Amino acid sequence: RRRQLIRQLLERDKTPLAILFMAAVVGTLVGLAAVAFDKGVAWLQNQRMGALVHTADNYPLLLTVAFLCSAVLAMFGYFLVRKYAPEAGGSGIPEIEGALEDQRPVRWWRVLPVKFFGGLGTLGGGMVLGREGPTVQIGGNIGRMVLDIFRLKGDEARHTLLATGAAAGLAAAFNAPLAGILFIIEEMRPQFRYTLISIKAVFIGVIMSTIMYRIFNHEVALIDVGKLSDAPLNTLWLYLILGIIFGIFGPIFNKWVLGMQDLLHRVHGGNITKWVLMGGAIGGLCGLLGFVAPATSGGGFNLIPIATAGNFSMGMLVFIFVARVITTLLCFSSGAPGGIFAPMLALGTVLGTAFGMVAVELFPQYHLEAGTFAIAGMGALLAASIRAPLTGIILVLEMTDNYQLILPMIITGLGATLLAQFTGGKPLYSAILARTLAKQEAEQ
Amino acid sequence: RRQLIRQLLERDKTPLAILFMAAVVGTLVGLAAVAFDKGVAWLQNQRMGALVHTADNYPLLLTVAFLCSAVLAMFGYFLVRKYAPEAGGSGIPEIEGALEDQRPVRWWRVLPVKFFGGLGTLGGGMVLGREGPTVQIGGNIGRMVLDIFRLKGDEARHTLLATGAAAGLAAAFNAPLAGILFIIEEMRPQFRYTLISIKAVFIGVIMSTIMYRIFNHEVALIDVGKLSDAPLNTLWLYLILGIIFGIFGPIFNKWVLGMQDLLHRVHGGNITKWVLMGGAIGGLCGLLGFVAPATSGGGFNLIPIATAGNFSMGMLVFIFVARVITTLLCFSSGAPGGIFAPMLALGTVLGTAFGMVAVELFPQYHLEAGTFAIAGMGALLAASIRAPLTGIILVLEMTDNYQLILPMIITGLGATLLAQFTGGKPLYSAILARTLAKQEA
Incomplete structure (x- = not known):
């Protein structure tokens, strides 16, 4: 040969x-x-x-x-x-x-x-x-x-x-x-x-x-964070800890989106009418939320620069996270035409910022900017739930243009995938195809 | 299934x-x-x-x-x-x-x-x-x-x-x-x-x-600084540059291969003639590394200088030609050392050259020659080594001018396209092919 x-x-x-x-x-x-x-x-x-x-x-x-x-x-x-x-x-x-x-x-x-x-x-x-x-x-x-x-x-x-x-x-x-x-x-x-x-x-x-x-x-970015601060070598160990956090939450969020597909299926049983209605209810909820708490609905691209700049309170971040975990599952698991890819960017940015806030107060000697942990965590749910770290990392780099955070971004992303693996989790996209492929045989 | x-x-x-x-x-x-x-x-x-x-x-x-x-x-x-x-x-x-x-x-x-x-x-x-x-x-x-x-x-x-x-x-x-x-x-x-x-x-x-x-830490190998953006009506120039690299790619590939053959005759495979030849080539670089340091060395030093447009057109031509020679002489001789990096300097120089011409030909594009340098920097990699994605991402990681990603991608892809269409081959795989075939023959 x-x-x-x-x-x-x-x-x-x-x-x-x-x-x-x-x-x-x-x-x-x-x-x-x-x-x-x-x-x-x-x-x-x-x-x-x-x-x-x-x-x-x-x-x-x-x-x-x-x-x-x-x-x-x-x-x-x-x-x-x-x-x-x-x-x-x-x-x-x-x-x-x-x-x-x-x-x-x-x-x-x-x-x-x-x-x-x-x-x-x-x-x-x-x-x-x-x-x-x-x-x-x-x-x-x-x-x-x-x-x-x-x-x-x-x-x-x-x-x-x-x-x-x-x-x-x-x-x-x-x-x-x-x-x-x-x-x-x-x-x-x-x-x-x-x-x-x-x-x-x-x-x-x-x-x-x-x-x-x-x-x-042209001339308008989807996400404008602006050049942030660098990340010292003695700061890196924090980004690994963040990855490990995404790493155990990843598979959990995966079980949820899958299980919520199951749970929401019972609501309509597969019937086109009950389903469309259920969809309208879910859709209407977002339109409501898109006015009473717009950060709990929508794509989420808008709250990313805000969170990264540290304009949210710790409580608001907790609110936005939990409320978006809910409105994401409800929207994607329902079977609506739309990706879960981008709403996982907002989920990561928020969770990352949260870590960044705690990290700021716990170590004033690191001279931390919470927004670096936001960017580090931005493509981390992708890294953990979707299990495509290299894509997520490069994506966030392409959107935020903060290359001086590549080591935090890579470390957090890789810490995510590692703990995502070690905690018995699977790539969300391949876990869905498997469910789809195996059902195609199940009904035989 | x-x-x-x-x-x-x-x-x-x-x-x-x-x-x-x-x-x-x-x-x-x-x-x-x-x-x-x-x-x-x-x-x-x-x-x-x-x-x-x-x-x-x-x-x-x-x-x-x-x-x-x-x-x-x-x-x-x-x-x-x-x-x-x-x-x-x-x-x-x-x-x-x-x-x-x-x-x-x-x-x-x-x-x-x-x-x-x-x-x-x-x-x-x-x-x-x-x-x-x-x-x-x-x-x-x-x-x-x-x-x-x-x-x-x-x-x-x-x-x-x-x-x-x-x-x-x-x-x-x-x-x-x-x-x-x-x-x-x-x-x-x-x-x-x-x-x-x-x-x-x-x-x-x-x-x-x-x-x-x-x-x-705290010192980059190459520091160009943030350059200007690249308007959409400017993009066609980056394709033209890629087409240039695209035809020079395979030529530089024949040369590095052919010079390996030519330099072999000089020593015939004999350890003494070879080492002596190596010392002659190596000695030339140390000489050149003092009389015209841009013609020798890794070339990382002249990249920012060229990109900031501090070289004259003639000096660029000189540096290019003189580095085409000293690159072939060093890598084809069999000396331990990659040709990867000296292709960066070759790309940066060729790009700037193009950038200089582009600047005077179209004052309406408000061009900065350094953009075409960065575009061309990973283009010889794109053309000769035929790994454009790695080259583009490399230059990005080294120059941090992401706002030139379209020029960089277009020039790189225009390189790999014309490199293929002009009957060239991946240098690294063309070398393994040489070696592997010399083995089963």
């Missing part, structure tokens, strides 16, 4: 020009799609806000049209999924992950409109869900779409273009190109066997997607 | 033994890489002090410059040619082959040979980098503790070997991310599945990086 390796080495990295070009197309489409989705979610959230100002006097009435506006939008989302594409419920990343194992179908003709407009309802209603979920699944299906349209034959194309789609999808959701590619090569790709996924091609899609996003969202 | 379901449920459960051992591999590789760096610096400083002793008689001072490096070079080539021929060159191809279980990891020989051999070449001021030594050593160290603790299994032999190479690159650049990325983009077995625990590679990279921070 030495003679084969010599053949293989000399023929390394020669991605078929057809695949490379189609990667540029997939990315461009996924980009525009992810942009349009983002524009749509924003608009609906703005319309709801204008409505509350049509009734800004009568508080109980205003408390109602907040609920209703989100309730209806949620119902419309749950319905689009339960009727035309049951696979577009939940994150969508587990499904695209199953597609890469050739174990789950890629019904783009159905999911593309269902996920887009379905998430548009849930997200636009102000439910605690993320854009990645939709954009990654949409992105994958878009990648699959142009594979079928142009009829590109071969395993490489079906795996690549599907991957570049998912990557261009995560990238455009966060303006994080590197994090997109890294998500594919750390988490998304087939984890237990060799694959023919051209990284160079995945790149091209990610580029075009990112470029598209920059064309429509 | 039922297999996958079984596999999913058991995903990411790296054996605790491997995890713990990865932490020691990184710790050792870290300290080792640090000690190597401290050694190289020391020797360069001694040579400098010697030049001060005779800082009057210019021809004499031109001589003791040559001789000090000549001897140090000779000592380096000798240690390799005698006790470990595998420790010549980068060493990254060798560890790559080690991961394919197609080359042996003679740590008992390579560790002292590479360390002290590289200490000679690097400390002599030869245009070579620390990665080569550190990465190769790193892997052996990983292999060393595998043997010592007798960790059985394919996973362990592949993991600990990888975390070692990773910890090696990381501690050579203070770039933890780029280290892990190097293993998962370039180093690891490229054509089949492997049992390399990423989480374990991380732990080694951490501890290694931590060790480096413990001894080299």
Whole structure:
């Protein structure tokens, strides 16, 4: 096999020009799609806000049209999924992950409109869900779409273009190109066997997607924390302790989101009507909370810079955390179209800040800024629950631009994954696919 | 399917033994890489002090410059040619082959040979980098503790070997991310599945990086400072630059390969002619390291200078050409030392050049040439070594100008694309192919 390796080495990295070009197309489409989705979610959230100002006097009435506006939008989302594409419920990343194992179908003709407009309802209603979920699944299906349209034959194309789609999808959701590619090569790709996924091609899609996003969202960052303070070497041991904290909470939050899927299933039993209604109730709750305590609802991107800057009180952080643990499970486990990826950034930033506050008072000699522990913990729930530390770390780096905290970020992230493993926890995205795959056999 | 379901449920459960051992591999590789760096610096400083002793008689001072490096070079080539021929060159191809279980990891020989051999070449001021030594050593160290603790299994032999190479690159650049990325983009077995625990590679990279921070804190290898942003209508220039690197990439690849052939004839494989040739090349660097220091050495010193646009266009042309020559002469000769880092200086210079032209051609873009330098900095890596993701993340970790990530990514990808389309190959895999085929023929 030495003679084969010599053949293989000399023929390394020669991605078929057809695949490379189609990667540029997939990315461009996924980009525009992810942009349009983002524009749509924003608009609906703005319309709801204008409505509350049509009734800004009568508080109980205003408390109602907040609920209703989100309730209806949620119902419309749950319905689009339960009727035309049951696979577009939940994150969508587990499904695209199953597609890469050739174990789950890629019904783009159905999911593309269902996920887009379905998430548009849930997200636009102000439910605690993320854009990645939709954009990654949409992105994958878009990648699959142009594979079928142009009829590109071969395993490489079906795996690549599907991957570049998912990557261009995560990238455009966060303006994080590197994090997109890294998500594919750390988490998304087939984890237990060799694959023919051209990284160079995945790149091209990610580029075009990112470029598209920059064309429509330039000069405003999703998260602006600003340059924080450095982290001394004698400070590092604190970030490991934080990781160990995320490390034991990770699997717990995992059991919850899974178990809550079970618990909420009984509420509707699988029936499209009880489910849509339950969705509207959950959706309406967020729209309500999105006015009476907006930090307990929504994507959470807004409270991240606030928490990092240390403008929240310890009690408020505890409130925001617990209240968001609740509104996250209720929104994701219900089966609503939307990722859990981004709301886990807000959950980490808060929990991290909390640690940072205690750390500040306990060691004035370290001259601590609690915001460093916020950034350290930001991609730590990802590290602990999703078990993709490298992606989370690079993501947070791409969003917060505080590279001088890379050691705290890596240490906390790795401490998370280690204790996540050692405490009998599993990658949330693969634990979902397993549940989905095994049910596909269970009912046989 | 039922297999996958079984596999999913058991995903990411790296054996605790491997995890713990990865932490020691990184710790050792870290300290080792640090000690190597401290050694190289020391020797360069001694040579400098010697030049001060005779800082009057210019021809004499031109001589003791040559001789000090000549001897140090000779000592380096000798240690390799005698006790470990595998420790010549980068060493990254060798560890790559080690991961394919197609080359042996003679740590008992390579560790002292590479360390002290590289200490000679690097400390002599030869245009070579620390990665080569550190990465190769790193892997052996990983292999060393595998043997010592007798960790059985394919996973362990592949993991600990990888975390070692990773910890090696990381501690050579203070770039933890780029280290892990190097293993998962370039180093690891490229054509089949492997049992390399990423989480374990991380732990080694951490501890290694931590060790480096413990001894080299508060001073960056490259400090450019925060540059200006890059407007969207400016992006097309970064593609053009990547296309330039994309066609020069393979050419520089033929040269490094071809010069290995050409320099072989000079010594025929004979240890004496070789060591003497090495001393001549090494002596040249020590000479050049005084008459035009930019034409010799690692090149890390001229990167910030070039990026801030303190060089003239002609000086850049000079530095480039003169460094293309001194890079080939140093790496192709078989001297222990990577070509990785001197490609950074080659990229930074070529980029700035492009940046200078771009500035005067389009005053409306309000350009700063230093942006194209950073864009081009990991572009030769992108073009010749064909590991763009690692190169881009490396430069990012070294220059901290994330607001140029699109230029950096576009230029890097424009490099790798044209590098492919112009019939070039991954230098590190083109070398392993050479070696592996010379073996079965």
